[PDB]
Each structure stands twice: as C-alpha cells, then as structure tokens.
From Swiss-Prot:
UniProt keyword list: Aspartyl protease, Disulfide bond, Hydrolase, Protease, Signal, Zymogen
Name of this chain's protein: Endothiapepsin
Source organism (scientific name): Cryphonectria parasitica (Chestnut blight fungus)
Keyword hit for Hydrolase: yes
Catalytic activity: Hydrolysis of proteins with specificity similar to that of pepsin A, prefers hydrophobic residues at P1 and P1', but does not cleave 14-Ala-|-Leu-15 in the B chain of insulin or Z-Glu-Tyr. Clots milk
Amino acid sequence: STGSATTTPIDSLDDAYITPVQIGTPAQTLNLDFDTGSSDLWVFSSETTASEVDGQTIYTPSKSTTAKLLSGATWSISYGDGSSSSGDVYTDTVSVGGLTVTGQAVESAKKVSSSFTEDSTIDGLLGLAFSTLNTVSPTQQKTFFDNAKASLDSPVFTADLGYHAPGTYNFGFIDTTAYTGSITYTAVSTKQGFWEWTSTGYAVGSGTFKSTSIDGIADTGTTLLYLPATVVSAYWAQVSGAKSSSSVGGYVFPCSATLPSFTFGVGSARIVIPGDYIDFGPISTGSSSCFGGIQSSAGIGINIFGDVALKAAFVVFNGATTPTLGFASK
Ligand SMILES: O=C(NC1CCCCC1)N[C@H]1[C@H](O)[C@@H](N2CCCCC2)[C@@H]2OC[C@H]1O2
C-alpha cells in the first residue's frame, strides 16, 4: 500500500503545514500538523474544554462506529515552544492520502495550552518520530507510520514541503519525479527517539564550505532552522544591521535587507536554502525589523533542521530496520 497527501502552509510565512486526515467512520476530516519531531497523534475533540476550542475542527468519537475507548490510557505532552496538551485515548481507523490504519491510537485532547487554542488552523498533531517518544500511559502507543509500515510497499515516508506553497507527504514510495539529481542518504541515531543525523557542514551565501559535524534532528513540526551559535553568528554577520535581540527572542534583521543563502552538508552533497526562505517577516505588523529563519539552538540542547531547511529539499524518512535519512535537491 501507499498514501499521498498534500500539505498546505497555514499562513503566508509557512509557520506550519496542515495535512487533511480522515478519522473514524463515517470519516471526520481534521487538518493535522505532521511532526517528525514528536510521536503522538492528538486531536481537538468533543472532550476538549469548551473555552479552549476556538475555530478548530473537532473529532467526536461518539459519532464514529469504529471508535473504541482505550481504557485507562492517558497522554500528556509538552513541546519545545512551551505549548502542551493532554487527555485520553481512543483507537479508530485513520487514513492519510488513501493509506488506512485500523486501530490507530487517536489521542483526544481534554486540555490544550493557549497557543493551540489561539491557532484556529491546526486541529491537532500527527507524530512521525519514533514510537519510543509516544506519551501514552500505561501502554505506549505506535505512530501512524509505525502501524502502517509493514503494509507499505517500502517502509518509508517522504516530506516535500513547499516554499510559500503546498507540498506533499508520501507514504510507502519515493516519487522519483519530485526531486533533481540523486538522493544522498545519511545515518540516523534513534537513541533520543528522533530522526537524528549529522550534517557535514555549512556555507553562507557564496562563501567557502566549512566542514564541521553538526548533529541535529529532522523536524517538520518546527518552523525554523536552529543551529550552534557560532554558525548562526557567521550567517547573520553577512546581513547589514542584523542583530540578536533578547527582547524579541532571536536574530532580527532590517526588512530592507537581501538575505544570503545558507548551504548545509549531507555527506558529500549540498542543500542550498535560498535567502528568501530565511525571511519570517516583520516582528510585528508594520515593523521594519524582520525575524530571522536561522536561530541559535544554544538554549535548546539539540540542533533542529526544521521547515526552513527541510523545505529546500526532498527528504526521505527511511524506516527500514536500520533507519536512515535521505536528502535531494528539488
Ligand atoms: O515547539 C515546537 N518546536 C520547538 C520550537 C522552539 C525550539 C525547539 C523546538 N514545535 C511545535 C510548534 O511550535 C507548534 N506551532 C503551531 C503553530 C505555529 C507553527 C508551530 C506545533 O505544535 C507542536 C509543534 O508544532
């Protein structure tokens, strides 16, 4: 089997991407944020505190004939941005782009933090990191991918995120028309539960490539690219007037600037992030200070190849017995 679903930016900045997901019978379609940096499939629901729901589409398990309470199971998750959610768990049929999993753990939110409530466009998350990070207790649950794996033509999924445009998630096959050149594969460590890999270095604009190992995670659920303070300083030093602002919470730059590209290494290969991909617009409406798409990971504990990096590539998440990650230009 295979599946293929279009993923769509939630706003003009590509802050995140939503992908329609069918849950239950008859199908209830929710727009979920596919996140290769977490491992819970959770949704706004009929059980979510009413004051915490504002415009989201909810899953109502009582209206699904295939829904079954996973008795005693609860979940609770916090994300790096400080947001959180928690609740109880049903199993139900979940389909993505024509690919169906029966008995998928669907984590129903009883509570969500304010950031989720405030974002009407995201109805939940669909985790695609390793199931060892799944928060369901007392019986940890498998991701959608993990459940689908054995049925797939090939035990892979691909992320092809668009710049200011829709893209695609495929399950079970590699679309050889979706990228240019070849796919370079690189080792993954699953020890932290992430698609963790080591970039071979970087360049800023037309500058010389610096060979240096940068360990980090491929994380579709993170908007920006978070890298060591040395690397980020070298990048923003090439933009006149750019500076790190503690009041704003990162590097900002004059909206009148032309940003240089940023290149990262995947083995001997190179992925080039165009300058424009690094512009996240005015810090507040009408401001001439713009927020940078490359930020320091210093206060995080891990480097994060988020959407800014990933959207520049066609990315293969290879879930074979020894997982690996593939990157191609496109
Ligand atoms: O918290 C992170 N990542 C951390 C960011 C800081 C540095 C460490 C990693 N990812 C989350 C993301 O911000 C959320 N958000 C939704 C609305 C706008 C788009 C993003 C979304 O919900 C959970 C997940 O995706």
